[PDB]
Design a binder for this molecule. Sequence first.
Ligand SMILES: O=C(Cn1ccnc1)NC[C@@]1(C(=O)Nc2cncc3ccccc23)CCOc2ccc(Cl)cc21
Ligand SMILES: O=C(Cn1ccnc1)NC[C@@]1(C(=O)Nc2cncc3ccccc23)CCOc2ccc(Cl)cc21
Lengths: 305, 301
Amino acid sequence: SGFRKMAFPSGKVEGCMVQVTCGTTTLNGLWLDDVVYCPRHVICTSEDMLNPNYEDLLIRKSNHNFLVQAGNVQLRVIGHSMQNCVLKLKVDTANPKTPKYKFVRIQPGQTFSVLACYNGSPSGVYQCAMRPNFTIKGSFLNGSCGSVGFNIDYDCVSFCYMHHMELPTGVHAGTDLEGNFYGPFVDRQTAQAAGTDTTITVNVLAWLYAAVINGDRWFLNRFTTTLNDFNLVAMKYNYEPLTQDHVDILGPLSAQTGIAVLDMCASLKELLQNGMNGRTILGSALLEDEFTPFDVVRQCSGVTF
Amino acid sequence: SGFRKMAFPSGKVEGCMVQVTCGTTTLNGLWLDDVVYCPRHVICTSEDMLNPNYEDLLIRKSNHNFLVQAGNVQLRVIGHSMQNCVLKLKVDTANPKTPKYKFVRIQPGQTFSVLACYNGSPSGVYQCAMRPNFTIKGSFLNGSCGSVGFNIDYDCVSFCYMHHMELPTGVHAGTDLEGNFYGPFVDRQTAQAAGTDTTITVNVLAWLYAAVINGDRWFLNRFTTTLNDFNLVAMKYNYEPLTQDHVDILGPLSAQTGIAVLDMCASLKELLQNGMNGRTILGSALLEDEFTPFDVVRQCS
Ligand SMILES: O=C(Cn1ccnc1)NC[C@@]1(C(=O)Nc2cncc3ccccc23)CCOc2ccc(Cl)cc21
Ligand SMILES: O=C(Cn1ccnc1)NC[C@@]1(C(=O)Nc2cncc3ccccc23)CCOc2ccc(Cl)cc21
């Protein structure tokens, strides 16, 4: 029993974290095989950040300008190239701790674990979700750039996020490992604002299923709803639309608990229109949307890595 | 900016997780140097869970009855001894991945990371607090026994908890790494109940300071309170008494934010009386008590 916000074990990623220094800026890099990946803004000064020409800044750099440190060992940079907003530093040594890995771009609503690092050293691991407005509500201080987001499938690490910046509201923006930003963000010191966020409906439903698996049934009701009536109500509360794909993905949880997805949707509709009325679900007074249906099945069935 | 429930990176502990089998029971063990630590109840059968005589059961066991598996390698058990409720299996190989470590017994309100494991394999990492009733609100299924709780100080792992059982309310009980249970629990299936739990007041105050550091000030008020008046109000909401030790520990956060501890105590009294009125504090509609003052300083600065 119990339901916690749980991250993947971070060991496979910790063995890849390195420190990247360029001039006065120090941030984190991901060392996989003979390449260190890091945010390209490591080459910027405070003036350069205002309006940077990264191709122009990078051409002026030499390999010896990038100081890469893996633990207490300095790695030798033998090449450098840029792929979108990520800098790739070719090093003379393949990381012996390189796990089986893939670079995957995730969709909003998908969750992943973040290994927050400072000076190439892992300091914490937390689970979060790619918000529908493409930001992540992370916990990051200055020096955390280059910290990565990942998932684990069997013994394979799928790297899905690299931290680049903090927006004025305290939310975070970053790229996939190919340097493509999530959301309409750019890596420049300029006015940028996160769009109005919405609730990840499929994830709230999955978390309501987790609550039922744990014995919390007070919110269940006798009613069902159509997918269109649920979406009409959901749109009014800034909830993401629920698609037939989401209904299908919730199939196993629906079969395990005996509560049809549209039956759970009618519970969610009442929760939105009436509130919790002083009650809680899994120790929360708010509807939690950072557990996907896969996270719920994985936690409630004990899948290992 | 931002405030998350954050666990320590689990890598140093993952390299210590092994699978321990004794008869038909399989659970997790912690392999440090040449010793595998695990709950002693791994030696129990169906007839031995109500009133086990562990000394009697262990004397009947031989080293070859304990099957220890580290990845796809079977370790050879060369000795066995019991220390309180933990079984120590001496093995013929020192764990090459043994980090710098210590065994530390924690106090209620203290937080730690849990690496939940099944069959010696890590499945997830989450953050916990030792509740004032000495239980932990974990997420554990059958087979998670032997999963450990820890903190990291620089490169040193402090092991503070080993999972032993789930109580009828779904909360969890276990021991330190010396086998001493936290709370009045025993490793028997005899009727056991967690005492009425209370809110870790010092941790709620620390989290209110984290909210102020992050720009959330709506709950602040112009009032202060005496320590005794705060405690008289706090007990009525099943909050733990706040001691002078707790006030002292909150000193650095008080200095950083400019809000005296008793001033923050009056904000907490107001929140308990009014509720949140549709507002949240750090994305939460409830007062969070699983961040210590040390966690807040570490995460924020
Ligand atoms: O690492 C540097 C260098 N640097 C040296 C001292 N100050 C900054 N700069 C990255 C920066 C950013 O936002 N990153 C940070 C990440 N996470 C949390 C943060 C908390 C506090 C302050 C910065 C944070 C600074 C602000 O301007 C921008 C704008 C765009 C981009 Cl892509 C990046 C940044
Ligand atoms: O593995 C054995 C079952 N066994 C058979 C044969 N020999 C032993 N026992 C562990 C047990 C316990 O509580 N563990 C579990 C831990 N975490 C989550 C759980 C979720 C579901 C079910 C069990 C859980 C079972 C219940 O009775 C007790 C009583 C005391 C103790 Cl210390 C241990 C246990």
